[PDB]
Paper text:
While minor modifications were made to optimise buffers for compatibility with the polymers, purification with CyclAPols resulted in clear elution fractions containing relatively pure AcrB protein consistent with a one-step purification. Initial 2D classes showed a clear AcrB trimer, with a good angular distribution within the data. The resultant 3D reconstruction, processed with C1 symmetry, achieved a final global resolution of 3.2 Å with clearly resolved density for the secondary structure and in most cases the side chains. The local resolution is lower for those helices on the surface of AcrB within the membrane domain, where density for the side chains could not be unambiguously resolved. The structure is asymmetric and exhibits a clear cavity at the interior of the trimer, which after model fitting was devoid of any density that could be assigned to lipids. At both contour levels, no density is present that could be assigned to the bound lipids. Comparison of the maps or overlay of the SMA and CyclAPol structures demonstrates no noticeable difference between structures and only minor variation in loop regions. There were also no identifiable lipids in the cryoEM structure of CyclAPol-purified AcrB, despite the clear evidence of co-purified lipids as observed by TLC experiments. Therefore, the apparent lack of lipids in the EM structure is likely due to their mobility which prevents them from being resolved. There is no noticeable change in structure compared to other amphipathic environments, although lipids are not currently visible, and this represents the joint highest resolution AcrB cryoEM structure.
Here we use an alternative type of amphipol: a cycloalkane-modified amphiphile polymer (CyclAPol) to extract Escherichia coli AcrB directly from the membrane and demonstrate that the protein can be isolated in a one-step purification with the resultant cryoEM structure achieving 3.2 Å resolution. Using Escherichia coli AcrB, we demonstrate that these APol derivatives (henceforth distinguished as CyclAPols) are capable of solubilising the protein of interest directly from the membrane. AcrB is an ideal model protein for such studies as it has been widely characterised with high-resolution cryoEM structures being determined in SMA (3.2 Å),40 saposin (3.2 Å)51 and most recently in liposomes (3.9 Å). Here we have shown that a modified cycloalkane APol negates the need for initial detergent extraction whilst maintaining the applicability to high-resolution EM structures.
Residue numbers in the entry:
A (entry chain C): 100 to 249
B (entry chain A): 250 to 399
C (entry chain B): 850 to 869, 872 to 899
D (entry chain B): 700 to 749
E (entry chain A): 50 to 199
F (entry chain A): 550 to 560, 565 to 672, 677 to 709, 711 to 828, 839 to 849, 851 to 868, 873 to 949
G (entry chain C): 750 to 793, 796 to 799
H (entry chain B): 50 to 99
């Protein structure tokens, strides 16, 4: 199977520039495959506290990756989805302020960045330097309120 | 050319900067016995043999040595190879001494010179056959194997 | 005797011709043949 | 050109020593004037992609 | 370049490390991210796996992450080598006469004798103790303010 | 009877001919504050050890414990083994004399040591943040277990492997002020990044070789926080604006190295038989994980008891007596005293080399016994 | 049209120390029937 | 498409072949850069290599 995959891969990258768009965006993947599940591991919450999304997010963020890296395990599939910061626009709301989803996208992409900005005292230094600190420009947003204040 | 002034004056890049051929980064510098130096930190691939890789580096460096600028020599600080050759070449010696000792030791106990020539030809035959057995089983000669033979 | 900074190298067909050993391969074949025949006839000088 | 016509002096040990490669040929050099371009207000990016 | 540990971790380490799943014969994985701005992820496979196939699988999972890294990481160029850990040997280049400084010797090594050693068989990683040249431009904020530039 | 007690009293690192010397300074130390320590080290070696050390090659800014501007390392190569006679001229003594001569240097951490062969023989340890706590909660739990390292012996010097937190300069930019002034946040970010961290632009040709072209501010203008006020930005209307017009600043704390283990935040912690009671020593939601040598060793007589049973059957078949074999396997503990006594007389422990010559001699005493009990 | 009726991945954010995704997408009430096409205006300064 | 010998030979060829390190069982490397805009790099491996 190792040789089979290798000589499928190096035969594929002859026809990888022919794909129009998806040559990028984590496209063509070559990997060995079985067809049926070894096992299904359910996860439920007795005391009514979590729901579909909370349970599936816990098992996506906290045990999915560990299982996918256990010895002998192949393709782990999740019956749910990890959390995202969903933003539900309102067409009768941005039309009253003459705005567009393009404006929403631009504002979010400009106010939720991680910017790398050097350090003070960095090499090549001048004789008599005693500092070596780093500089912290803006960082990413972490909570619903911070996203609400954009 | 950066920009043109109102009167027609020109602003060149050298007017606002200080062009110089420096290094890509200044984080790292080395000195050899005080005086300035540089060097290469060669690692070793997984599975490669450490003795015939050093020989290849040494035979490559012999190929680009004639074209060095005026007065530029290479030195060999920390280098883990010559110890290996000396130790292996050390164990072998003692083994060859033991044959003379037995050819003498047994001579001492049996005083016929004719009959003391049989074990002196028996032990080298088995010693040399062991190497061939190793070359059939896919082993190498190392500290452990040479000590197993001694 | 080319100007300084100019070097040379063999490639292609001549590269392997340089890096490897024909007389050493048959030389040992002669002694191996001789030893086989000495074992056959149970004597020396018969191989010659 | 020194090594060739320098080894030819030996026709009893070396024959037909040829260069195996194309020779220098003419080319049409064109240069855009940064000073002139900037003044009139044409950008080098558009000049190049024209 | 010019990024701290938090930025480097968030934008590179986790993005690369959430894609390393489904690799055969893997024991553990451990990564670093320091304020120089450099990531270092090590994946250790079991005793007796095939090193080059292990590298092929790791590379296959990495090419799914490249579209997600920043342009500044990609431009620099990421790398995947199956080197060991401890220096096999270190060569050094000194100037006896005293014509060249550290920068000149580092440039000579990098430009003329680093590539030929990296292509020699059995050499997994080559660390250069210095830096190669680069047309370095040092800006002057007072001049940029004077001429109304940025 | 005596043998038993003797085989429970005994518990080979070569000189390799070369060793290293690692240097590390408290976080935030400049490059020349490290060059001075490297100079102290090279002077000490190349003078006090004039009879052993051949060359040093100290390299500043590189380190096996990560890179950085404070760290540093110094290789060192010794003279030939035949030219350094004694027990005090071996690496095992040079790298105790020097390390005990390097506690004199203040604000440093200078050790000279020697490598083994393959992979210290300690207990490598991890502290995985399995809940989602943060960095302070783990940093607070990292020293809570470190402070509980009293008791007493493979414990002793047990410390972390990371770097402690360091001051960092936070510069906060107000979007509304930037927009009101008309400047662009992209201009702010690119000016700051290019001036204080450098910026790869494109390539140029240097003697026929392709090389890079960088952009950065001259060192004189990016050394102190007060230099922030020299950098301006063109606004839309065509006017320069200093950073004080749309930014604040404050000093805060951050971490230089961040480490992860199996994809989760972690902190590593670098007579006896490897601390089995290291585990049960517990905060909120943290875990334990052994790696390197600790993970390997964790994961003898079973194959030794089957070798003594097969030789009896091998002998039984040879002699056909079901009692004759006993004699052959009765001189096994007789020729095992020669090694034990000798080993427990020079301090040779129980290396794979002494444990293999044991088997050679109990496999030769059997030779000796059989060739006579056959004739008998 | 794409960001309204299909959703768009904008960039990441940090949640409890883990990198997640950010999506913009229209509310479900305005993405159900064909008649909802005339609910979305695209700016010219006027919207059309 | 468009580039000549020099343009191909230092924006593509040199970049590509400065990244060819860490390949097992390599004997040598050669390349051509011609005025049609094509580059052509050839890697020859030891006999017996897979």
């Amino acid at each position: 199977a190792d040789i089979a995959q290798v000589q499928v891969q190096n035969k594929l990258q002859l026809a990888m520039p022919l794909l129009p768009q998806e040559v990028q965006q984590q496209g063509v993947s070559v990997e060995k495959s079985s067809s049926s599940f070894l096992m299904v591991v359910g996860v439920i919450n007795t005391d009514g506290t979590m729901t579909q999304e909370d349970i599936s997010d816990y098992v996506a963020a906290n045990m999915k990756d560990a299982i996918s890296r256990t010895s002998g395990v192949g393709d782990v599939q999740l019956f749910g989805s990890q959390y995202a910061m969903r933003i539900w626009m309102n067409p009768n709301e941005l039309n009253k302020f003459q705005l567009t989803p393009v404006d929403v996208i631009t504002a979010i992409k400009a106010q939720n960045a991680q910017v790398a900005a050097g350090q003070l005292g960095g090499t090549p230094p001048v004789k008599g330097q005693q500092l070596n600190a780093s500089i912290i420009a803006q960082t990413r947003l972490t909570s619903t309120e911070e996203f609400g204040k954009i | 050319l950066l920009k043109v002034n109102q009167d027609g004056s020109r602003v060149l890049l050298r007017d606002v900067a200080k062009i110089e051929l420096g290094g890509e980064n200044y984080d790292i510098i080395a000195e050899f016995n005080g005086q300035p130096a540089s060097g290469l930190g060669i690692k070793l691939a997984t599975g490669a043999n450490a003795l015939d890789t050093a020989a290849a580096i040494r035979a490559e460096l012999a190929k680009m040595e004639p074209f060095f600028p005026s007065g530029l020599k290479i030195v060999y600080p920390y280098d883990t190879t010559p110890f290996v050759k000396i130790s292996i070449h050390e164990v072998v010696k003692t083994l060859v001494e033991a044959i003379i000792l037995v050819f003498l030791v047994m001579y001492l106990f049996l005083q016929n010179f004719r009959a003391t020539l049989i074990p002196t030809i028996a032990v080298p035959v088995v010693l040399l056959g062991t190497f061939a057995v190793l070359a059939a089983f896919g082993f190498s000669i190392n500290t452990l194997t040479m000590f197993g033979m001694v | 005797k080319l100007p300084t900074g100019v070097g040379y190298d063999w490639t292609g067909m001549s590269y392997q011709e340089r890096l490897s050993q024909a007389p050493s391969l048959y030389a040992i074949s002669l002694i191996v043949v001789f030893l086989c025949l000495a074992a056959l006839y149970e004597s020396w000088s018969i191989p010659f | 050109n020194q090594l060739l016509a320098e080894a030819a002096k030996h026709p009893d040990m070396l024959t037909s020593v040829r260069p195996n490669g194309l020779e220098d040929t003419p080319q049409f050099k064109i240069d855009i004037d940064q000073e002139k371009a900037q003044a009139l207000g044409v950008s080098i990016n558009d000049i190049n992609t024209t | 370049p010019g990024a701290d540990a938090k930025t480097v971790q968030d934008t590179v380490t986790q993005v690369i490390e959430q894609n390393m799943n489904g690799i055969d014969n893997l024991m553990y994985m451990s990564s670093n991210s320091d304020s120089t701005g450099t990531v270092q992820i090590t994946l250790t496979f079991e005793s007796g796996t095939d090193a080059d196939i292990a590298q092929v699988q790791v590379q296959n999972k990495l090419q799914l992450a490249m579209p997600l890294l920043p342009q500044e990481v990609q431009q620099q160029g990421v790398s995947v080598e199956k080197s060991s850990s401890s220096f096999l040997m270190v060569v050094g280049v000194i100037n006896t006469d005293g014509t060249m400084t550290q920068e000149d010797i580092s440039d000579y090594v990098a430009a003329n004798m680093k590539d030929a050693i990296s292509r020699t068989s059995g050499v997994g990683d080559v660390q250069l103790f210095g830096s190669q040249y680069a047309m370095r431009i040092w800006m002057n904020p007072n001049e940029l303010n004077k001429f109304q530039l940025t | 009877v005596g043998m038993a007690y003797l085989f429970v009293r005994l518990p080979p690192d070569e000189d390799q001919g070369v060793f290293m010397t690692m240097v590390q300074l408290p976080a935030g130390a400049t490059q020349e504050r490290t060059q001075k320590v490297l100079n102290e080290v090279t002077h000490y070696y190349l003078t006090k050890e004039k009879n052993n050390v051949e060359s040093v090659f100290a390299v500043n800014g590189f380190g096996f414990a990560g890179r950085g501007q404070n760290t540093g390392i110094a290789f060192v190569s010794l003279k030939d083994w035949a030219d350094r006679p004694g027990e005090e001229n071996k690496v095992e003594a040079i790298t105790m004399r020097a390390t005990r001569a390097f506690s004199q240097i203040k604000d440093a951490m200078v050790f000279a040591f020697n490598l083994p062969a393959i992979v210290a023989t300690g207990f490598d340890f991890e502290l995985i943040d399995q809940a989602g706590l943060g960095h302070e909660k783990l940093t607070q739990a990292r020293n809570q277990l470190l402070a509980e390292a009293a008791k007493h012996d493979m414990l002793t010097s047990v410390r972390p492997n990371g770097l402690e937190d360091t001051p960092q300069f936070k510069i906060d930019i107000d979007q509304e002020k930037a927009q009101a002034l008309g400047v662009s946040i992209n201009d702010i970010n690119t000016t700051l990044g290019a001036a204080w961290g450098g910026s790869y632009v494109n390539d140029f040709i240097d003697r026929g070789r392709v090389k890079k072209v960088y952009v950065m501010s001259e060192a004189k203008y990016r050394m102190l926080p007060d230099d922030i006020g020299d950098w301006y930005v063109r606004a839309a209307d065509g006017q320069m604006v200093p950073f004080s017009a749309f930014s604040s600043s404050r000093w805060e704390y951050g971490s230089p190295r961040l480490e992860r283990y199996n994809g989760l935040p972690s902190m590593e912690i670098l007579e006896a038989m490897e601390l089995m009671e290291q585990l049960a020593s517990l905060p909120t939601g943290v875990g334990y994980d052994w790696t390197g040598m600790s993970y390997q060793e964790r994961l003898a007589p079973s194959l030794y008891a089957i070798s003594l049973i097969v030789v009896f059957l091998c002998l039984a078949a040879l002699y056909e007596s079901w009692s004759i074999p006993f004699s052959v396997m009765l001189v096994v503990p007789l020729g095992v005293i020669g090694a034990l006594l000798a080993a427990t007389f020079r301090g040779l422990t129980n290396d794979v080399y002494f444990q293999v010559g044991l088997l050679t001699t109990i496999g030769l005493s059997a030779k000796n016994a059989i060739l006579i009990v056959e004739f008998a």
